[PDB]
Write an enzyme that holds these catalytic residues in place. Structure first.
Site, mmCIF file in Angstrom:
data_model
loop_
_atom_site.group_PDB
_atom_site.id
_atom_site.type_symbol
_atom_site.label_atom_id
_atom_site.label_comp_id
_atom_site.label_asym_id
_atom_site.label_seq_id
_atom_site.Cartn_x
_atom_site.Cartn_y
_atom_site.Cartn_z
ATOM 1 N N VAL A 69 17.405 16.370 8.968
ATOM 2 C CA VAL A 69 18.761 16.903 9.114
ATOM 3 C C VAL A 69 19.764 15.898 8.556
ATOM 4 O O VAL A 69 19.676 14.710 8.873
ATOM 5 C CB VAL A 69 19.099 17.130 10.604
ATOM 6 C CG1 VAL A 69 20.547 17.609 10.771
ATOM 7 C CG2 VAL A 69 18.080 18.055 11.271
ATOM 8 N N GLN A 129 -0.081 6.318 11.507
ATOM 9 C CA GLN A 129 0.095 6.854 10.154
ATOM 10 C C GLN A 129 1.538 7.264 9.921
ATOM 11 O O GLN A 129 2.098 8.043 10.686
ATOM 12 C CB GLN A 129 -0.833 8.048 9.920
ATOM 13 C CG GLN A 129 -1.077 8.421 8.467
ATOM 14 C CD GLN A 129 0.139 9.001 7.786
ATOM 15 O OE1 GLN A 129 0.815 9.879 8.330
ATOM 16 N NE2 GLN A 129 0.410 8.539 6.566
ATOM 17 N N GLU A 166 19.243 6.651 8.305
ATOM 18 C CA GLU A 166 18.550 7.826 8.838
ATOM 19 C C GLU A 166 18.298 7.755 10.331
ATOM 20 O O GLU A 166 17.952 6.677 10.877
ATOM 21 C CB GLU A 166 17.183 7.988 8.163
ATOM 22 C CG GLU A 166 17.218 8.497 6.730
ATOM 23 C CD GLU A 166 17.536 9.977 6.658
ATOM 24 O OE1 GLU A 166 18.046 10.542 7.647
ATOM 25 O OE2 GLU A 166 17.261 10.590 5.619
ATOM 26 N N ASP A 223 0.985 1.742 19.961
ATOM 27 C CA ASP A 223 0.615 1.222 18.646
ATOM 28 C C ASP A 223 1.472 1.873 17.562
ATOM 29 O O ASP A 223 2.139 2.869 17.823
ATOM 30 C CB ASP A 223 -0.885 1.496 18.424
ATOM 31 C CG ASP A 223 -1.471 0.737 17.254
ATOM 32 O OD1 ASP A 223 -2.654 1.009 16.951
ATOM 33 O OD2 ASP A 223 -0.784 -0.122 16.640
ATOM 34 N N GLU A 235 23.837 9.000 6.191
ATOM 35 C CA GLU A 235 22.796 8.686 5.216
ATOM 36 C C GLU A 235 23.328 8.134 3.908
ATOM 37 O O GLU A 235 24.429 8.460 3.461
ATOM 38 C CB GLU A 235 21.990 9.926 4.861
ATOM 39 C CG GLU A 235 21.187 10.529 5.986
ATOM 40 C CD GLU A 235 21.965 11.571 6.772
ATOM 41 O OE1 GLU A 235 23.207 11.715 6.609
ATOM 42 O OE2 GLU A 235 21.321 12.273 7.556
ATOM 43 N N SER A 266 3.676 2.789 8.261
ATOM 44 C CA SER A 266 3.399 1.729 7.291
ATOM 45 C C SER A 266 4.602 1.349 6.454
ATOM 46 O O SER A 266 5.353 2.210 6.008
ATOM 47 C CB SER A 266 2.270 2.154 6.358
ATOM 48 O OG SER A 266 1.024 2.145 7.041
ATOM 49 N N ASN A 312 17.390 11.499 12.305
ATOM 50 C CA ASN A 312 16.564 12.676 12.063
ATOM 51 C C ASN A 312 16.316 12.829 10.559
ATOM 52 O O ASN A 312 17.247 13.105 9.808
ATOM 53 C CB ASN A 312 17.239 13.933 12.624
ATOM 54 C CG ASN A 312 16.328 15.137 12.585
ATOM 55 O OD1 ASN A 312 15.646 15.394 11.574
ATOM 56 N ND2 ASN A 312 16.281 15.872 13.697
ATOM 57 N N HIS A 314 0.830 -1.222 0.000
ATOM 58 C CA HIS A 314 0.000 0.000 0.000
ATOM 59 C C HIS A 314 0.858 1.263 0.000
ATOM 60 O O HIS A 314 0.360 2.355 -0.260
ATOM 61 C CB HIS A 314 -1.094 0.008 1.103
ATOM 62 C CG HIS A 314 -0.627 0.457 2.457
ATOM 63 N ND1 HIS A 314 -0.218 -0.423 3.441
ATOM 64 C CD2 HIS A 314 -0.529 1.695 3.000
ATOM 65 C CE1 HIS A 314 0.125 0.256 4.523
ATOM 66 N NE2 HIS A 314 -0.065 1.544 4.286
ATOM 67 N N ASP A 345 -0.188 -7.517 1.836
ATOM 68 C CA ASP A 345 0.336 -6.153 1.815
ATOM 69 C C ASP A 345 1.855 -6.158 1.939
ATOM 70 O O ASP A 345 2.406 -5.893 3.013
ATOM 71 C CB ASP A 345 -0.298 -5.309 2.926
ATOM 72 C CG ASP A 345 0.034 -3.837 2.818
ATOM 73 O OD1 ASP A 345 0.509 -3.383 1.744
ATOM 74 O OD2 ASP A 345 -0.211 -3.118 3.816
HETATM 75 C C1 LIG Z 1 -7.004 5.933 8.522
HETATM 76 O O1 LIG Z 1 -6.668 6.318 9.859
HETATM 77 C C2 LIG Z 1 -5.316 6.212 10.362
HETATM 78 O O2 LIG Z 1 -4.755 7.211 10.788
HETATM 79 C C3 LIG Z 1 -4.633 4.877 10.349
HETATM 80 C C4 LIG Z 1 -3.120 5.049 10.302
HETATM 81 C C5 LIG Z 1 -2.432 3.726 10.548
HETATM 82 C C6 LIG Z 1 -1.660 3.164 9.529
HETATM 83 C C7 LIG Z 1 -1.027 1.946 9.783
HETATM 84 C C8 LIG Z 1 -1.169 1.319 11.020
HETATM 85 C C9 LIG Z 1 -1.940 1.888 12.039
HETATM 86 C C10 LIG Z 1 -2.093 1.202 13.376
HETATM 87 N N1 LIG Z 1 -2.837 1.731 14.365
HETATM 88 N N2 LIG Z 1 -1.453 0.063 13.614
HETATM 89 C C11 LIG Z 1 -2.578 3.100 11.786
HETATM 90 N N3 LIG Z 1 -4.890 4.118 9.141
HETATM 91 C C12 LIG Z 1 -5.374 2.904 9.346
HETATM 92 O O3 LIG Z 1 -5.579 2.536 10.489
HETATM 93 C C13 LIG Z 1 -5.671 2.001 8.164
HETATM 94 N N4 LIG Z 1 -5.628 2.638 6.860
HETATM 95 S S1 LIG Z 1 -6.819 2.434 5.795
HETATM 96 O O4 LIG Z 1 -7.950 3.206 6.228
HETATM 97 O O5 LIG Z 1 -6.416 2.844 4.479
HETATM 98 C C14 LIG Z 1 -7.225 0.884 5.746
HETATM 99 C C15 LIG Z 1 -8.148 0.383 6.668
HETATM 100 C C16 LIG Z 1 -8.520 -0.962 6.659
HETATM 101 C C17 LIG Z 1 -7.963 -1.836 5.730
HETATM 102 C C18 LIG Z 1 -8.344 -3.298 5.721
HETATM 103 C C19 LIG Z 1 -7.032 -1.346 4.815
HETATM 104 C C20 LIG Z 1 -6.662 0.001 4.824
HETATM 105 CA CA LIG Z 2 19.100 12.520 8.354
#
Ligand SMILES: COC(=O)[C@H](Cc1cccc(C(=N)N)c1)NC(=O)CNS(=O)(=O)c1ccc(C)cc1
Ligand SMILES: [Ca+2]
Length: 223
Positions: free
Chosen positions: A57, A174, A52, A171, A62, A177, A54, A40, A84
């Site tokens: 910076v 965003q 990496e 956890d 790097e 990933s 920071n 994704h 995925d």
């Molecule tokens: C959409 O809201 C968000 O902020 C989270 C970010 C995120 C990304 C990766 C992991 C986590 C986590 N808490 N471990 C959080 N996205 C999501 O949670 C998912 N993105 S999503 O909405 O695109 C999505 C939802 C469901 C499916 C099956 C596939 C894709």
């Molecule tokens: Ca750097």
């Protein structure tokens, strides 16, 4: 990463940042020529950033190397995130060193309860947003499928596992990933999805790497 800690510079030397003018996903160095990440996270014009800490910076360790080829898993489903996983070949081999190093692929899978290290430059807030500059780390156990499914009401496949804390507070999030979940010295997971971050009964969902090692190995051998 929410509820984690500052890793320390280059203490996760297999962690890469995927950059398309800005950090957008993590990844893991598998050998001098190849990175594994989440399908994704696919996009054109990827520059892999190795060594990496920071990400805003230039600190002196790097290596920036453009992707020459990306290979999304044959069976990747963008609706469910089944399969995925994506491979990225570098235009030139990375110079391997103590701060730029590969992570071992599993020879067997990890069982429920196994502790793992999850890392990335993703959002650090469960409510709202704050994006860190330095790499963040989190220790979290793999959850049983049954507990995870009953708690979350998520639909997951056998190519996914849950990890984290059902009580909330810790956890991935965003921006994490594509990055690594390393358990007992093997890359067992890739940060894939979830709902929100660090919410009660909504643990993180991770691509189950051990299901893909044959595909990874043959893909690298043939490309
Ligand atoms: C959409 O809201 C968000 O902020 C989270 C970010 C995120 C990304 C990766 C992991 C986590 C986590 N808490 N471990 C959080 N996205 C999501 O949670 C998912 N993105 S999503 O909405 O695109 C999505 C939802 C469901 C499916 C099956 C596939 C894709
Ligand atoms: Ca750097």
């Amino acid at each position: 990463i929410v509820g984690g800690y500052t890793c320390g510079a280059n203490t996760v030397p297999y962690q890469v940042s995927l950059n398309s003018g800005y950090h957008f996903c993590g990844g893991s160095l598998i050998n001098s020529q190849w990175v594994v990440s989440a399908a994704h996270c696919y996009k054109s014009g990827i520059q892999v950033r190795l060594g990496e800490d920071n990400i805003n910076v230039v600190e002196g360790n790097e290596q920036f190397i453009s992707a020459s080829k990306s290979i999304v898993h044959p069976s990747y489903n963008s609706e469910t995130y089944n399969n995925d996983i994506m491979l990225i070949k570098l235009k030139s081999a990375a110079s391997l060193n103590s701060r730029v190093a590969s992570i071992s692929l599993p020879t067997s899978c990890a069982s429920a309860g196994t502790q793992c290290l999850i890392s990335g430059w993703g959002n650090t807030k469960s409510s709202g947003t704050s994006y860190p500059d330095v790499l963040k780390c989190l220790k979290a156990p793999i959850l049983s499928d049954s507990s995870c499914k009953s708690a979350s009401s998520f639909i997951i496949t056998s190519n996914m596992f849950c990890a984290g804390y059902l009580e909330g507070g810790k956890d991935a999030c965003q921006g994490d990933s594509g990055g690594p979940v390393v358990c007992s010295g093997k890359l067992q997971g890739i940060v894939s999805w979830g709902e929100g971050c660090a919410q009660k009964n909504k643990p993180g969902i991770y691509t189950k790497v051990c299901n893909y090692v044959s595909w990874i190995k043959q893909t690298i051998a043939s490309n």
